[PDB]
């Protein structure tokens with residue numbers, strides 16, 4: 049499982065690789081991942097739940113597209129470690 053490959057396939061269109069939302073992402077309500085305060089206050093579980101369930105009118109759920117292993121592999125990408 050390549051976490052970054054999954055991110056480029058499924059997430060990049062709203063959350064850019066640099067840790068900054070795209071124009072589309074920001075319009076829907078996304079904020080920066082590249083933020084020390086956000087990273088410090090956000091648990092892995094919150095990240096996993098967000099990928100799994102999304103947010104109505106903002107982010108689609110990915111639970112029916114990705115396995116728990118694949119969702120977990122995305123955590124160190126969101127964290128900025130690749």
Ligand code: HEC
Pocket residue numbers: 055058059060061062063072073076077078079090094095098099102103106107108110122126
């Ligand atoms: C645009 C249609 C999006 C795609 C594709 C992905 N995400 Fe997203 N995400 C989007 C918005 C508008 C928001 C804000 C909504 C909210 O309730 O916070 C988000 C949010 C996140 C978060 C934040 C959770 C938190 O508690 O702050 C994470 C960690 C996140 N999104 C990750 C993520 C991943 C890994 C994706 C690919 C599988 C992905 N998102 C797709 C918009 C969009």
Ligand SMILES: [Zn+2]
Pocket residue numbers: 050052053
């Ligand atoms: Zn890679």
Ligand SMILES: [Zn+2]
Pocket residue numbers: 054057058
């Ligand atoms: Zn895929």
Ligand SMILES: [Zn+2]
Pocket residue numbers: 057058059
């Ligand atoms: Zn997709």
Ligand SMILES: [Zn+2]
Pocket residue numbers: 063064065066067068069079080081082
């Ligand atoms: Zn980002």
Ligand SMILES: [Zn+2]
Pocket residue numbers: 074
């Ligand atoms: Zn802005």
Ligand SMILES: [Zn+2]
Pocket residue numbers: 083084085086
């Ligand atoms: Zn900050």
Ligand SMILES: [Zn+2]
Pocket residue numbers: 092
């Ligand atoms: Zn962690």
Ligand SMILES: [Zn+2]
Pocket residue numbers: 093
């Ligand atoms: Zn819990």
Ligand SMILES: [Zn+2]
Pocket residue numbers: none
């Ligand atoms: Zn709990």
Ligand SMILES: [Zn+2]
Pocket residue numbers: 097
């Ligand atoms: Zn919750």
Ligand SMILES: [Zn+2]
Pocket residue numbers: 103
């Ligand atoms: Zn939310």
